[PDB]
Amino acid sequence: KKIITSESVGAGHPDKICDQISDAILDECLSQDQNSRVACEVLACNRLIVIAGEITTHAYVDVVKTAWEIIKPLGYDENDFTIISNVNKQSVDIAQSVDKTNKNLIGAGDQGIVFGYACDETPQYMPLTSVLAHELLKEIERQRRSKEFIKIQADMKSQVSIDYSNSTPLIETMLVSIQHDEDYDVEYFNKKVSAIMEQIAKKYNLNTNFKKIINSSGRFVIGGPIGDTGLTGRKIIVDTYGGVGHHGGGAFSGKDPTKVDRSASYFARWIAKNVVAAKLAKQCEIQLAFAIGQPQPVAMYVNTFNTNLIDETKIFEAIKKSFNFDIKTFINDLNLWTTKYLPVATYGHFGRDDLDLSWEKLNKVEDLIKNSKH
């Protein structure tokens, strides 16, 4: 059997708490000052939250109040954490490279490599393993908040394995771990989780006879930052493509759009998704590489995994003709100065049928089709 597996984590997972605080701080800066330079990193461990990084802005963000906005809906209060604010300014050496003399150009905020990915497995143009893993946790957290699923807490993880041996996928295993109250009823808990798992499988017209692994540790009462240290940018595969897509290593949360790790990753997704939606391939991955201070990528590679429906050279040419690779220009084309990032800090940045993200729009299919012709 060909068994592929991906994961997700919930809103009370400690790494995700950090991503949410980073992006909530970013969103508050950008709401006040659209030219903010923000690289906000957070650490959450036991009873300490550290808010750090490099920010140059006209805004003022109350980082304590912002942190409380993320942690109060998970059950924490104002006395649970020491908060350390260590906000440095952006290095003037980086800033002079980004802010070019030509005021219509933005130089890349760093070197690096990013990958964008899309496939035709799901309506989201995402790997089915990742879609199912996120949907499981979104439903559990929805029920936790509405009180349809009682005596659970917000720290949780999922993992879904799919059998791709035949042309119809089968679910092989669904796994969930959910932090629970000391006085929980394990029979009620197992039945709730089993039902949620089946409901998600049925929503995607899949089999319902898969293995279920429910709270395999056998006890999960200690959780959140008490059980495990969180840091920003430690769930980059959960944030992206579940291990089916390649990754260049850059984290998203807490970064303004001049950080190409974020903005060019969104751009690359937008390209790949439109290539696949245009039916030029079943799977498409776009690698882009950058040099600090340079306003365009220094390299690009387009991989269609032998699923291309037209010549690879024509795909590559259609992409070059249909997209503008100037950083300032693609930041503007995707409205990244006015996008709210907090909503993508949980449950993935891509394929979000619950959100309206610019990099998910299929508005380049007509250009790609026209530019790919004979």
3-state DSSP call for residue 149? coil
Coil, strand or helix: which one is 84? strand
Q: Are 302 and 115 in contact (CB under 8 A)?
A: no
Q: Which is nearer to a second copy, 121 or 141 (CB)?
A: 121
Rounded Cα–Cα distance for residues 35 and 20 (Å): 21
Q: Which of these segments, 61-69, 119-127, 325-333, 340-348, binds a second copy (CB under 8 A)?
A: 119-127
Work out which of 93, 147, 373, 374 binds a second copy, going by CB under 8 A. Answer: 93
Q: At what angle do helices 312-322 and 365-372 cross, to 10 degrees?
A: 130
H or E, element range at 303: strand 299-303
We find the least distance from the C-beta atom of residue 298 to a second copy, in angstroms, to be 6
Nearest residue (CB) to a second copy, 64 versus 170:
170
**Does 220 engage in binding with ligand SAM (CB under 6 A)?**
yes
Binding positions for ligand SAM, 287-306, rule CB under 6 A: 292
Question: Which x/- pattern, by CB under 8 A, does the window 140-179 give for a second copy?
Answer: --------x--------x-x-x---xxxx-x-xx-x-x--
Choosing from 61, 106, 200, 251, the residue that interacts with a second copy (CB under 8 A) is 251
* Of positions 63, 71, 315, 368, contacts ligand SAM by CB under 6 A: 63
Breaks (C-N over 2.5 A) in the chain follow: none
In this complex, which beta carbon is closest to ligand SAM, that of residue 272 or of residue 336? 336
Window 229 to 248, contacts with ligand SAM (CB under 6 A): none
User: Which of residues 39 and 275 has its CB atom nearest to ligand SAM in the complex?
Assistant: 39
Q: Which letter does DSSP use for residue 79 in this model?
A: T
Smallest CA-to-CA distance from 314 within 268, 370, 245 is with 370
Considering only the stretches 69-77, 238-246, 262-270, 340-348, report the one whose residues sit in contact with a second copy under the rule CB under 8 A: 238-246
Q: What are phi and psi of 82, to 5 degrees?
A: -70, 135
- Rounded to the nearest 10 degrees, what angle do helices 128-146 and 186-203 cross at? 130
The pairing of beta strand 211-214 with beta strand 170-180: parallel
Partner that binds at residue 55, options a second copy, ligand SAM, none, CB closer than 5 to 8 Å by kind: ligand SAM
Distance CA 233, CA 239 (A): 9
Please state, in angstroms and rounded to a whole number, the distance separating the CA atoms of residues 84 and 73. Answer: 21
Q: Which of residues 294, 307, 329, 358 is near a second copy by CB under 8 A?
A: 294
Sole window of 54-62, 273-281, 282-290, 355-363 interacting with ligand SAM (rule: CB under 6 A): 54-62
**Least distance to ligand SAM, CB of residue 367, Å:** 32
**List 184, 291, 326, 329, residue binding a second copy (CB under 8 A):** 291
Residue 53 has φ and ψ, to the nearest 5°, of: 115, -165
| Residue 72: CB minimum distance to a second copy, A | 22
Which tokens hold the place of 267? 């751009």
Site for ligand SAM, residues 103 to 132, rule: CB under 6 A: 109-110
CB 372, CB 280: distance < 8 Å = yes
Task: Identify which of residues 75 and 165 has a Cβ nearer to ligand SAM in the complex.
Answer: 75
The one among 69, 163, 198, 228 contacting ligand SAM by CB under 6 A: 228
The footprint of a second copy on residues 39-58 (CB under 8 A) is 39, 41, 43, 45-46, 48, 50, 52-54
Residue 79 touching a second copy (CB under 8 A):
no
Q: In the block, which residue shows the tokens 């319902």?
A: 208
Q: Could you write out the DSSP letters of every residue in 213-271?
A: EE-TTS---S-GGGTS-EETTS-TTTTTTTTTS---S---TTB-TTSHHHHHHHHHHHH
Select from ligand SAM, a second copy, none the partner in contact with residue 233, using the beta carbon and a kind-dependent cut-off of 5 to 8 Å.
a second copy
d(CA 38, CA 168): 45
Whole-number Å distance between alpha carbons of 78 and 76: 7
Among 74, 236, 272, 345, binds a second copy (CB under 8 A): 236
Residues that bind ligand SAM (CB under 6 A): 13-14, 39, 54-61, 63, 87, 89-91, 93-94, 109-110, 155, 157, 177, 217, 219-220, 223, 227-228, 259, 292
